[PDB]
Amino acid sequence: MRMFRITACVPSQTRIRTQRELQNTYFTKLVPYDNWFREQQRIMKMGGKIVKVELATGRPGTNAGLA
Amino acid sequence: WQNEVRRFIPQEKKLTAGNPMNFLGMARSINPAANTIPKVSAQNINIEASVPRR
Amino acid sequence: SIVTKSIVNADAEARYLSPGELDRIKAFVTGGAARLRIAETLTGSRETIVKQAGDRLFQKRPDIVSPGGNAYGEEMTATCLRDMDYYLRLVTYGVVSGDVTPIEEIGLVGVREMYRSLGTPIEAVAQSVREMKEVASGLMSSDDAAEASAYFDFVIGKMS
Amino acid sequence: SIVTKSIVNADAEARYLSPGELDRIKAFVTGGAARLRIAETLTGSRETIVKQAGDRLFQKRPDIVSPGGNAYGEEMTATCLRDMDYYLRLVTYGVVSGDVTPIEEIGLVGVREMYRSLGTPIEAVAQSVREMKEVASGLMSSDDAAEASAYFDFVIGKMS
Amino acid sequence: SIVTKSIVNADAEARYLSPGELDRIKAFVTGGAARLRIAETLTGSRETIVKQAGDRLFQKRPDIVSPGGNAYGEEMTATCLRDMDYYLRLVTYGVVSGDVTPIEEIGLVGVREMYRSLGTPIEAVAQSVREMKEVASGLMSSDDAAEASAYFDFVIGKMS
Amino acid sequence: MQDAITAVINSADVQGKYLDGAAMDKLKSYFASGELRVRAASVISANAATIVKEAVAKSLLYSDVTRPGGNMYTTRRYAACIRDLDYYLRYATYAMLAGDASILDERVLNGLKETYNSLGVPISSTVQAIQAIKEVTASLVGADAGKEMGVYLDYICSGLS
Amino acid sequence: MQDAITAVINSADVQGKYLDGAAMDKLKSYFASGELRVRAASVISANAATIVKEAVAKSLLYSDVTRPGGNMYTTRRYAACIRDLDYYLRYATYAMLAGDASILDERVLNGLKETYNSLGVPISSTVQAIQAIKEVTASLVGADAGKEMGVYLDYICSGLS
Amino acid sequence: MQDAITAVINSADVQGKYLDGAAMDKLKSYFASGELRVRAASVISANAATIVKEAVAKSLLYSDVTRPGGNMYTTRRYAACIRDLDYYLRYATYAMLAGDASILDERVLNGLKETYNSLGVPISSTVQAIQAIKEVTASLVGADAGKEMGVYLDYICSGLS
Amino acid sequence: MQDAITAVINSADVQGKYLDGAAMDKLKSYFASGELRVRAASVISANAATIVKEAVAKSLLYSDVTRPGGNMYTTRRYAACIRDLDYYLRYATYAMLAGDASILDERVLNGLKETYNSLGVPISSTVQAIQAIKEVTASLVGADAGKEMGVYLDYICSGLS
Amino acid sequence: MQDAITAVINSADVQGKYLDGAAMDKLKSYFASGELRVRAASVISANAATIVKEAVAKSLLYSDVTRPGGNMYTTRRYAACIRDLDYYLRYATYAMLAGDASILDERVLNGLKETYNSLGVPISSTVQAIQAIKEVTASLVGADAGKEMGVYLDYICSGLS
Amino acid sequence: SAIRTEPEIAYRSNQGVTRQRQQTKVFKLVSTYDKVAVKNAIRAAYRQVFERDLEPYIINSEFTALESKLSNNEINVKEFIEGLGTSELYMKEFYAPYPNTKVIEMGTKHFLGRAPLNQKEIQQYNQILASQGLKAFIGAMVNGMEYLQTFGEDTVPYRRFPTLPAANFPNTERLYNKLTKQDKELVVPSFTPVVKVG
């Protein structure tokens, strides 16, 4: 469905969480295309830094057959 | 010996704010100028260069 | 209302009102005489602002009044002027309240869906309220023109 | 294609394709000859359909090409006829695909945002594609008129 | 209806319907076709029967149409003929239903309160529907005139 | 939910026999309905906004409901009523394709009366809106499809009122 | 929610007309009261912990409910009680700034009765607590601002009763 | 994000002393500029759709970008480009309010150039669209406010390049 | 139920104090208005039926509510509506005698809203029928006594709205 | 209603068998307690005016409800509260003589909370009046005989809360 | 005070908020190397989303691809929950047999752990359901700010016990205290406005 793969570093700026937090601090995740704009807006609002982003799934510049 | 005979219509409903009947007279006083009928037939137009290109 | 907006923000932050919000309420509650004077100016000039702005809108965009247009007949033009009176009343309400929340709650949420269902060009409605703003600023004092033009500005921005 | 729609449903429910949609794909690949026939007939008669449907659109809504509208001038009606030709090519793509997925993924999602940014009467574009449906049904065979007009009618429903 | 009056009586008396009463709904459903004939001939000749009834009332009681009267006006005679046609509708509903129940449920309960609010003579409207009875006996066949004129006797006795 | 074909399948299965002659001629009735239902669905999905548009124009527009004071007043409530009528038209089309009102009383009517009483939505005005959809669909799809569509729409009216 | 000026605006809106002279007179009445409302809100926001402290000391402490097994027992529940009276005083300050008791039955009284019934909370003990807040605030801020605070606090009491 | 004032605070805090005279002068400069920033914000919020409409008309319409074979062909990609330019205008207006481009660095530019390179989006065409936005808003709000508005727009362009 | 005098007595009873000067001059106002109220009572009791007659004549005759399908159709519903207007006029006379609206609160408006909603009674036409009663009794009994009758009938209208 | 012995009989009849040995043991436990129950019931019936007198004196006089405007004010309401506490003591004596708390939710607590909520009766004041009742009763009939009175008066408190 | 007899002892033993707030387990997928813990988090996600174990309601596990991506750690628990929401099983058991308001209720119960906040949230989610279906609805309510502030990208959602706003805690209590398919009525149909605008 032409999804993205990203690496982002999201720190915590308001709470000192006493359990393990690398799995939601520095992560690599598969994000769908129609959800990626909202996900990126969410990360940039939460203060994360998008280290890397690429279109690991699908072909860029496709007109039809993107489903 | 005069007699008071009423009418088939009831009393007229009092015109309120949201009803556009109170703006009909002001629309008439505007009398907005319509546009002339455009005399284009679109068979003589050719879609390869009359579409702009910049 | 500015009091309603500050109460909503304080409730969202789960706190009492800040001194900045509180003396903004103080400044509004002292300076409301000018805003109610603006509201009386708009209420007195209600018919002429709508009339002149309707004439200017139909001069600028005659294809909402042409055959095939959304507002063709004299009754359709009366509905156009009715919508203009609606939005002038909302601008008066916003001037009185000091905040755009009554305007949002009455005539800006779902306006795109409403005018999509009615077939009405919402960019031409934005032009209509723009000419209403122009006429009101023409017949209003300059500081009062800016104060009313803030709410006219918000209505233009949310339509367009 | 409806094989792509069936492959989407099968992969989403995480199972092999149902025998129902198997023989629907069988029906599609039997009827693909008639679908290809309708495709090249519309390809051959694209220009007469777009010109006659644009003419009937202009009789229905003369405000489109009047001064003040979106399409005033030979330039701005040439781009409207080009939009019509774009939608006709999309309908041919959908007919030759068997589904409405290429039509919606080329020209129907985001089109309200596009034509809102352009200020275009989307209901008049819907009436334009209605006139295209009428001209194509008149020019084309009656048995295939239903199957092509269904896809035209999908464009009407998604656009209006 | 005769079935609904009998079943209300049986429901109040806490019993099944008495076999005489089942025999009489049996008699009503065997003899019902003549009632349908009465209904269709009254529906066919509604305008002339009400013409003759109103004209002979205006002959017999000139005080009704005299100056100062409730039914003095041209308007007032028109709404008198309205009430005439209403009671004709009630008689047709009653001869269809086989009982006095629709007449009492629609146009007899509270009718004295209505007509004393309006100032109209209840004896005069009873005379009107009595004249409907006599012209109906003149116009319609003699055997069904017994049932139709009998229901007319009910409404004149209940109204006067 | 269920349609008429799964209704007769489940009615056969609950008593535990195969398909009998009553199931046979019920299926024959549904297949005979068939083409008419799918053509009515095609033309409704074609002009989907048209029925709700001139239905609101016929019934709801220019009245005390859409004047100030009424519940059609304000643009959010107007768009909500357009959304509600699109819901009603879509679900009536779904029941028309099904042949049963299971999607009607199982997706619409449960909770609708009490949430409309909570929101102050006029039940009679919604009924007149549904009647307007019935009349415009009868004008657009024909006679037999129009009257079975009217059966489903006044089933919605009878459930809501 | 709704304050006094939005109440005036909605009262004009339901009848559709603009704001006449009586609307401006009510607006000037609210503008006259705004000084008192602002200073009372500042005083209550400055001292808000002391009010609920004095109220709980006056009406809740050394009783059966704070003796063990009661609802004021088990310190989590005591902190929730202090939080509840802080919520009551804060929303009463909101309603006092507003001039209308719409926030009280929108964002406080909505479901509060069955909340306390599901949690086993003594209703009249809470009512006595808000009345304790009432004379503490009346002694704190004065007779007229204390009167307005008393109006909204016993509006909360009457909704909770 | 940060503004001009918070940037002054952080620049004082990293070397850990109080606000000196230069920090006071910078705060005075921002407080003087705030009037013009507010009026430019109001004008841009009025003409948000007009600016992006005129900019895309004067820069990218009837070109190879919007022709077939271009990246802005199809309504999906047109609506995506329109949304991109609208968010660029809104966030540049935010930076014009704040007086500091940290919101551009933290909420517009991280993960955006690499996303555009992943999707094949033309960087030069997006830059030209932002320049068209710059010229339209400079003609529409004035040269004085349009100076720093174009400063933040060229900051977006330089980050994207 | 309480009149103005016993309303003053009960208010002072809940206040726990004797009658101060506000109670005394409110009582003097009632004693001044009593002769006017007695004269208006005599006029309305003389013309009880005719006021309802001319009010229903000038409000809802020859209209859609009296048409079939309307709720004043059939003699049962018509006489019920006339008895409703008689109830409204008699209880407005009672409240005009009392100088208080407690009789309208507890004996008229209690349950009337949901009663009319269950019956389908048109609220707006009922309100304008009460308005017609107001105009007839204002033309009949005088300006000031008509004004008190009008404000009590408008209290009935606001309770029914 | 039900007591301990008919509770044994009903628990036998729910499972459908005869009375087994544990049923006989429960019956003999009730027969052992019955002398104490009869003695305590005789003492409470002899002194029942004194218990309610001292309980109202130690819990209800000199309070906000007893000051004017309160619920304990107006001697009719005062004697009605006395009669209510007499009813509570008499039915608690019935329950103590019975051995099961079924008479409270069959003849006292049925609708009692709804009654007091509609009546504006202070719930916590009634609860502390019941606490004064059970304290005076436990002081009068002893700790062991007062244990069952504590059971049933606290059952009234738990039902009414 | 008093003797504190056994009926009210059993009453006041369970008095305030029920102990299920503390007597639960919060499933945080700490690391994907522990495949047993991955499977535990996956079954807990199934139980949270579908209120029960989905063994009598599958042919086979149709989410096995999602389990594979979660075990390989190129998707997170948030994307696993979103994949469960945008599935045919969730719409079969929670969207097909329920009206759209009930779909809003069950969706915020399974995903946000609490009742809908207000009529504004009800209107927004009803607009999303009317426009784009339930997949965009699940995506919006999972990618919203509240889900990330409460659960984050690594935590299976759980039943929440809120305090603010009004009626949110009792409507959450009445939405979670009834078991699956207990009744078809609406716990929170809509919030009655104290002021009707226009």
Ligand SMILES: *[C@@H](C)[C@H]1/C(=C/c2[nH]c(/C=C3N=C(/C=C4\NC(=O)C(CC)=C4C)C(C)=C\3CCC(=O)O)c(CCC(=O)O)c2C)NC(=O)[C@@H]1C
């Ligand atoms: C001529 C013989 C009669 C006449 C009649 C008369 N009628 C009216 C006006 C009304 N009549 C009705 C009656 C009905 N309403 C119903 O629903 C039914 C059927 C169940 C009936 C029969 C009503 C309601 C009116 C009031 C207005 C209306 O027409 O709806 C008038 C006018 C009185 C006036 O003051 O306007 C008259 C004169 N006059 C007579 O003497 C005979 C009784």
Ligand SMILES: *[C@@H](C)[C@H]1/C(=C/c2[nH]c(/C=C3N=C(/C=C4\NC(=O)C(CC)=C4C)C(C)=C\3CCC(=O)O)c(CCC(=O)O)c2C)NC(=O)[C@@H]1C
């Ligand atoms: C000396 C040890 C310290 C101290 C104590 C102190 N506490 C209070 C008042 C109260 N303490 C409680 C405590 C609890 N409630 C619970 O549920 C639990 C856990 C089971 C505890 C520990 C309560 C409820 C009160 C309120 C009064 C009451 O008994 O209900 C006081 C009295 C304060 C007053 O003025 O009334 C004091 C003095 N004070 C100190 O300075 C030492 C640090």
Ligand SMILES: *[C@@H](C)[C@H]1/C(=C/c2[nH]c(/C=C3N=C(/C=C4\NC(=O)C(CC)=C4C)C(C)=C\3CCC(=O)O)c(CCC(=O)O)c2C)NC(=O)[C@@H]1C
């Ligand atoms: C001397 C005059 C006599 C006397 C009086 C006395 N009364 C009380 C106690 C109370 N009296 C009332 C009375 C009323 N409640 C009402 O609602 C009304 C109508 C307005 C009345 C008159 C009440 C409620 C009390 C209870 C206590 C209170 O203060 O409210 C006492 C006190 C008894 C005690 O032990 O507390 C006394 C002394 N006693 C006499 O011997 C004289 C004959």
Ligand SMILES: *[C@H](C)[C@H]1/C(=C/c2[nH]c(/C=C3N=C(/C=C4\NC(=O)C(CC)=C4C)C(C)=C\3CCC(=O)O)c(CCC(=O)O)c2C)NC(=O)[C@@H]1C
């Ligand atoms: C302390 C020796 C030095 C240092 C520390 C520092 N750490 C952070 C923030 C984070 N630290 C971690 C590391 C872990 N989290 C885990 O769960 C585990 C394994 C159990 C490890 C090793 C993470 C993930 C963060 C980011 C999340 C968070 O902030 O809690 C900071 C804050 C960075 C910031 O400003 O956001 C700091 C300063 N820095 C030093 O100078 C000390 C020498």
Ligand SMILES: *[C@H](C)[C@H]1/C(=C/c2[nH]c(/C=C3N=C(/C=C4\NC(=O)C(CC)=C4C)C(C)=C\3CCC(=O)O)c(CCC(=O)O)c2C)NC(=O)[C@@H]1C
């Ligand atoms: C005039 C400048 C433009 C335009 C106007 C036009 N409007 C209508 C009809 C309606 N407009 C509304 C709007 C509102 N309802 C509200 O509650 C509010 C906020 C207070 C608003 C703004 C409504 C409800 C209608 C429907 C009719 C009614 O009065 O209820 C029309 C008529 C369309 C029709 O088919 O009847 C027209 C023509 N059209 C233009 O071209 C100008 C851009």
Ligand SMILES: *[C@H](C)[C@H]1/C(=C/c2[nH]c(/C=C3N=C(/C=C4\NC(=O)C(CC)=C4C)C(C)=C\3CCC(=O)O)c(CCC(=O)O)c2C)NC(=O)[C@@H]1C
């Ligand atoms: C339109 C015919 C009339 C009417 C409509 C109206 N509706 C709302 C709001 C809502 N309607 C619903 C109902 C549904 N829930 C479901 O699950 C379904 C079927 C799938 C339906 C139809 C709901 C939940 C709402 C609230 C959410 C929303 O607003 O979209 C309103 C708004 C009321 C308000 O202000 O909150 C209105 C006005 N009312 C009329 O007057 C028209 C005649």
Ligand SMILES: *[C@H](C)[C@H]1/C(=C/c2[nH]c(/C=C3N=C(/C=C4\NC(=O)C(CC)=C4C)C(C)=C\3CCC(=O)O)c(CCC(=O)O)c2C)NC(=O)[C@@H]1C
């Ligand atoms: C004609 C039926 C109506 C009409 C048309 C009209 N369109 C435009 C401008 C544009 N149209 C498009 C369309 C598409 N691009 C795509 O990729 C697809 C799908 C394949 C479509 C349908 C575009 C991109 C434009 C922008 C111009 C460009 O192509 O560069 C205009 C011009 C408006 C303007 O220039 O501002 C017009 C007039 N307008 C009507 O009123 C008719 C109803």
Ligand SMILES: *[C@H](C)[C@H]1/C(=C/c2[nH]c(/C=C3N=C(/C=C4\NC(=O)C(CC)=C4C)C(C)=C\3CCC(=O)O)c(CCC(=O)O)c2C)NC(=O)[C@@H]1C
């Ligand atoms: C428009 C100026 C040019 C351009 C645009 C274009 N954009 C997309 C799609 C996306 N753009 C973004 C970028 C952003 N993320 C952010 O957080 C912000 C600022 C708030 C921006 C601007 C993202 C994330 C996407 C993908 C998500 C989505 O599309 O919803 C496309 C589509 C690419 C495709 O293959 O579909 C296009 C075409 N390209 C041009 O040619 C214009 C010159």
Ligand SMILES: *[C@H](C)[C@H]1/C(=C/c2[nH]c(/C=C3N=C(/C=C4\NC(=O)C(CC)=C4C)C(C)=C\3CCC(=O)O)c(CCC(=O)O)c2C)NC(=O)[C@@H]1C
């Ligand atoms: C007349 C203005 C409009 C109207 C009236 C109408 N009312 C009824 C019936 C009832 N009216 C009441 C009202 C009261 N009863 C009381 O005791 C009091 C206070 C003392 C009031 C205000 C009630 C309870 C009823 C129901 C009992 C009954 O059957 O009479 C009806 C009849 C409804 C029916 O289904 O028969 C009607 C028609 N409706 C209109 O259209 C007029 C505009």
Ligand SMILES: *[C@H](C)[C@H]1/C(=C/c2[nH]c(/C=C3N=C(/C=C4\NC(=O)C(CC)=C4C)C(C)=C\3CCC(=O)O)c(CCC(=O)O)c2C)NC(=O)[C@@H]1C
């Ligand atoms: C305190 C003096 C009295 C009392 C109350 C009590 N309340 C709770 C807990 C809750 N109270 C609420 C109610 C509200 N929700 C709202 O939105 C508002 C207005 C803003 C209110 C008032 C809710 C939802 C809770 C539960 C939330 C929580 O986390 O507790 C408790 C605690 C119960 C527990 O088990 O924690 C108590 C004890 N009980 C008394 O005896 C006093 C009279």
